[PDB]
Structures are given as structure tokens and as C-alpha cells.
């Protein structure tokens, strides 16, 4: 006789910083990213809102 029960889940990350690349495939392929040098060939200012 076990009482009715509902699942809870969590995760924990300690010693990590979340990383979001600045690539269109999200991979590392060289430190200067492929969108970093795409923004040299399209010299324009933009705002960033996060």
C-alpha cells in the first residue's frame, strides 16, 4: 500500500557558466567565430536586448 505520488525532477550545475556561442551551427571552429567576421563584412551598429 503505497500512496499516490507525482514525479518531481531537477538538475544541478555547479562550477559551470552557461555558454551560448555566436555561430549559426553553434560549434567551435576557431576562436574568431564565423559570424564575428560576418560582422566585419557588414559594418553596421546594432543594439542587443537580452
Amino acid at each position: 500500500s503505497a500512496v499516490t505520488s507525482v514525479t518531481q525532477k531537477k538538475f544541478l550545475c555547479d562550477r559551470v557558466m552557461w555558454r551560448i556561442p555566436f555561430s549559426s551551427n553553434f560549434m567551435s571552429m576557431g576562436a574568431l567565430t564565423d559570424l564575428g567576421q560576418n560582422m566585419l563584412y557588414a559594418n553596421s551598429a546594432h543594439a542587443l536586448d537580452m
Binding site: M27, S28, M29, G30, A31
Partner: peptide, 22 residues
């Protein structure tokens, strides 16, 4: 040993392999 932000191919893929237009 190897780690991140260092996985560099330099070279592209396709337009070096000769193609010419119609």
C-alpha cells in the same frame, strides 16, 4: 592536451573544386 576554441580547420569546402557557370 587539446581543449576548446582551438578546433581550427582554416579551409572551406566547395568552390575550390572547379565549377563553371551556364
Amino acid at each position: 592536451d587539446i581543449n576548446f576554441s582551438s578546433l581550427a580547420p582554416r579551409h572551406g569546402t566547395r568552390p575550390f573544386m572547379g565549377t563553371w557557370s551556364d
